[PDB]
Symmetry: D2
Subunit: 255 residues, 4 copies
């Protein structure tokens, strides 16, 4: 691709291992202007330090907790005032309690079920609504999912039902916003060592199964997710919406 | 033959409810049935509808599935009243008109989370409570629609709630499998019911089935009920985590 | 209850055939059964396995599905001998043994087309001839495996033939639905049979089911048979173009 | 997606409307060296005229009928001697007799069913076996499918079963060749007016349905397929194998 003169919002960098920082490095290398969103103070401090690795001439950082309508609304409105219109959004945001994740699925609390839906699925819908205002000639929105949204995976529990909700959200958003020339798609990433992965029980056995069974016989990394994001966020994928691309060494295709 | 079987049926409002098709079939097969409801008006309908069944007695429980206490205490009383059960038919969903009748991107946070709560989470907590009355095993069936698998015009917030429900069925199947409790869904084709008045363009959905589905006709509540009898019985003993389309073959075409 | 129903069962070779689990179930339910075989050996095997069914007489027809004339003439004779039928169970597949181990990219043209011919095209031509014996409608069921949906090690050429068969089921559903003929598939979990010996690594396939499937056990032929009875009966009115997994839930997990 | 110093073999150009020619135009624009295979001499003649629109300094044209083991085997052997090792193959080849693309599917002949399997699915398998010989360090193999392989579509009939067969071929090949660092993927193209499309009954009503019902409300073109091929054929799609990308205006995702 070639992304000079384009601007993308990346939501959900926490540190150097985040899937979303792989996305940022790829887009930055390709010429894009980037805008970053975070929830914790600590995530902002990591962003400021990670920006030194990038070619970005200015820091554009906005605090946006996606539990709050007003923060998503005011945040995107401020972004539009600061950088003008945008070309797409990369959504790399999910959350569930340890306490629900690490017990039987049938014991999941209502509170923890709805928390995981709210942050990991509904956030895309409201982000799309606000981001559309900054994309009057169209644009591209990408969210990050996992195969536990399509099949029951041991231990992924409440988050597999949130990812199923997220993948349907992508399809319904693609149908709604398609007439505005806004494409919406998902990347189904293979397991990658991150801060959030520490919440998944048996994560090391999940990585070891990919090496042993997946067609490519190896795990993927953040930058490979980034390279598919660049495709999805750019005019290379102009015909493609409502799609879920598995960046997982082909694990999705085998049993 | 379901004699000496007992099933709980959740979600009859009136004679057109999909769950009443399920009841008629199970009743005809000899099952003892227990019914749950939310509104007073639904209990009144159930009382009238039971005169068409062969049930020697009315076993009726109010359970609003938005309340943990109601589900917990509801299934507790069912166990005291009738003993162990063999399965549960879940036929419950809800969403606001306000969110089936605005653009999907304009869905409210409270409307999205309401539909998830009633239409998806309810299965999880009902399974947790019902398992206490199934020590030997049993069978749980929920009702979904093809808009959980593909984006269908107007179905909007309910399609994301059914995608959530269908994953719920798979994760419950994995969890409760070792306890010998199967969990499955029936993906029913469109049927004129009270809830169907919330879906915009409903008559256009029905016509498209008669015109394009393999059987070239719509299904009815009794056909759902006949597939529920298979899922709830020993005929399906090998089958869990599955979604059977009772929809004249519409799911298979494009 | 299948009394006064008549079904043709294709693909019994011995006591371990999936189609023999089917036959035991349909028979127990009071169906009249017709059997087709390829080689005399399966005829004799059949003749003795029949001793264990309550079929008061032996309707046995040699049909090699590689031959149009045999399929055509065989179904014509069935009709003269017994009259109109209510359905067909198809349990027929083949691939050369060297094609069910090692490297898929080394598959010969001849063995790729052989597998397609026997394991997929044979459904098409059987449907066409059996339709003639179903003027009021009926039900056709074929046996498939999860290897038609996902690349499974060793299954190789048979995985591509099963993918072909599953699409075959869907196109036949669409074509034949207006004639009130339903066409569905059962995706059986691994079961030790004669043909099962041909598949590289079969024993490791079984183990993985016990360890990882939701029910934590393997299925058997009779469980495939009970789901066949559902698909072949009026209980599954409204269901066509479907693939029901009878696999302890293995399809639903990763 | 800079492809200078890459070489790709493109199979299945017949004329300017061919999907494989949209692929050719994109890969050539990106700097790749291109080799073309054809069956009919009239296709050779059209390639010769079409090369005048590309930046290729030489015509590398090989006649390969994929019904012939020898022609596939010798053609790829000849290709390796002329240009050396390659980076990937784009497979744009299918065939069925016209009477099997309208009316009733249950009436399909054995001979027409096996013909469509042979040309449209098995050809991928033998091409991958022969192409792997020219890709010692890895590579990428892309085939062209349709949604009729995943769902029963009116009139598509015998070709639907041949595309289901192709899509499983792609998966099994992905698994087999993954340890060799060969990726295998499909593109599921939406309907495009081509010489082959003339054999599909009701084709004009298929096109119209996409415009009326697909998320983007417009049909796709050959160049859009090409842009996705450039992605799948390049290092951008590392970590992606056994996948089927729909380039169809989102129509796959709706019902
Ligand atoms: N790692 C994997 O193996 C894997 C595989 C497939 C998919 N995914 C998906 O990839 C995405 C990114 O996760 P990751 O693995 O890169 O882990 P990560 O670095 O921990 O990133 C997760 C991000 O989510 C943000 N987040 C959580 N709740 C939020 C809220 N209410 N408002 C705003 N942001 C919030 C966190 O921000 P703060 O830290 O500031 O709170 C953090 O930046 C997630 O959707 C995840 O499910 C991960
Ligand atoms: N009709 C169709 O075309 C169709 C097709 C496919 C799937 N479905 C699904 O089929 C199921 C049955 O619906 P239906 O069409 O038969 O309509 P229905 O007759 O309106 O039944 C819907 C039921 O949901 C119950 N319910 C709603 N909220 C509840 C709550 N908070 N607590 C307890 N019960 C609650 C209602 O009870 P009250 O009236 O007492 O409040 C009512 O009995 C639903 O899951 C629906 O999504 C319907
Ligand atoms: N066993 C499993 O784990 C499993 C799992 C899923 C699906 N399946 C499927 O189940 C079906 C039956 O296999 P099985 O396991 O039951 O093995 P089986 O007992 O060996 O049955 C295979 C049958 O195919 C028949 N057959 C082969 N070619 C024929 C031809 N050209 N014309 C007529 N009949 C022909 C054989 O008849 P002859 O012996 O007379 O030649 C034999 O009766 C197959 O479709 C298989 O792919 C099996
Ligand atoms: N057009 C569409 O709407 C569409 C949509 C989705 C997928 N597809 C797929 O796209 C691919 C390309 O088709 P197209 O639409 O671009 O039509 P096309 O221009 O007619 O191309 C079809 C190609 O197949 C080649 N072919 C047929 N038999 C062959 C053989 N035995 N050996 C070698 N080559 C052979 C033809 O070569 P000769 O002319 O030299 O015989 C021709 O170049 C096909 O796989 C098709 O199924 C098309
Ligand atoms: C097993 C691969 C995987 C690892 C990390 C993930 O991110 C999470 C997980 C749970 C809560 C929040 C984010 C994820 O979705 C999938
Ligand atoms: C289009 C077929 C259809 C009709 C009715 C439904 O039930 C609902 C719908 C919305 C809210 C609550 C229940 C449903 O799920 C699917
Ligand atoms: C691995 C489960 C399985 C076992 C047996 C099968 O029947 C065959 C296998 C190969 C050739 C012919 C029939 C089958 O299809 C799948
Ligand atoms: C309806 C979209 C469509 C158009 C053309 C195609 O190419 C063919 C069709 C039949 C025989 C050979 C090639 C194809 O596969 C799909
Ligand atoms: N001991 C944890 C593993 C922690 C992790 O892998 O994230 C478990 O298996 O529950
Ligand atoms: N009147 C609704 C649709 C009515 C229906 O459910 O058929 C509309 O806005 O189209
Ligand atoms: N085919 C490209 C890269 C594709 C791959 O990632 O295998 C190459 O030969 O460099
Ligand atoms: N309309 C013709 C063919 C359409 C075309 O492919 O040009 C038919 O339906 O038979």
């Amino acid at each position: 691709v070639n992304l000079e003169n384009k601007t993308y919002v990346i939501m959900g960098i926490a540190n150097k291992r985040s899937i979303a920082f792989g996305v940022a490095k790829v887009l930055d290398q390709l010429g894009a202007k980037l805008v970053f969103t975070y929830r914790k103070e600590r995530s902002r401090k990591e962003l400021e330090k990670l920006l030194e690795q990038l070619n970005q001439p200015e820091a554009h950082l906005y605090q946006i907790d996606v539990q709050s309508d007003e923060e998503v609304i005011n945040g995107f409105e401020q972004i539009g005032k600061d950088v003008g219109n945008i070309d797409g959004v990369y959504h790399s945001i999910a959350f569930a309690n340890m306490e629900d994740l690490r017990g039987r699925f049938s014991e999941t609390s209502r509170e923890g079920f709805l928390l995981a839906q709210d942050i990991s699925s509904y956030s895309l819908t409201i982000v799309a609504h606000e981001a559309k205002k900054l994309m009057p000639e169209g644009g591209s929105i990408v969210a990050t999912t996992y195969l536990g949204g399509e099949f029951a995976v041991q231990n992924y529990n409440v988050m597999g039902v949130a990812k199923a909700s997220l993948e349907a959200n992508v399809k319904y958003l693609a149908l709604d916003l398609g007439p505005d020339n806004i494409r919406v798609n998902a990347i189904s990433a293979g397991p990658i060592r991150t801060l959030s992965a520490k919440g998944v029980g048996g994560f090391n056995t999940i990585l070891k199964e990919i090496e042993e069974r997946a067609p490519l016989k190896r795990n993927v990394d953040q930058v490979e997710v980034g390279k598919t994001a660049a495709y999805l966020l750019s005019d290379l994928s102009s015909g493609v919406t409502g799609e879920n691309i598995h960046v997982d060494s082909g694990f999705h295709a085998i049993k």
